Design a protein around this nucleic acid. Structure first.
Length: 51
DNA sequence: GCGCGTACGTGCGTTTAAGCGGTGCTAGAGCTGTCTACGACCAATTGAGCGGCCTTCGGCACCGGGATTCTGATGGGCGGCCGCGTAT
């Protein structure tokens, strides 16, 4: 139960960062691309899927 | 170290819902195409900003003068010294 709470914490913040750009971009269908930059912000850079 | 307790791992059976590949639909990203507003650039004038330089009143904490309270030598008067001393 404890971890689910955190998992949620983490998703929330990242998706929070991600969603804004997508809105910024005048679109709904939020991209994988945002998922990542948003991750790069919080400080969890990912190698694999992007740009 | 040791001992008590119990909770969490390992199993089977029951059960529940992910993953698969099948189709359909249209939304929303991506492209594309024309206009023009807003930002860069160059100019000239102006005062906000920085170095240089020294300001004044208020607040913390040390202070100031005057009446008043407590301690000390002074002193006549009632008593006691019993022991040397003059007079008959």
């Amino acid at each position: 139960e404890e971890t689910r709470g955190v998992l949620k914490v983490f998703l929330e913040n990242v998706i929070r960062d991600a969603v804004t750009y997508t809105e910024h971009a005048k679109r709904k269908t939020v991209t994988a691309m945002d998922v990542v930059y948003a991750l790069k912000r919080q400080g969890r850079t990912l190698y694999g899927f992007g740009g």
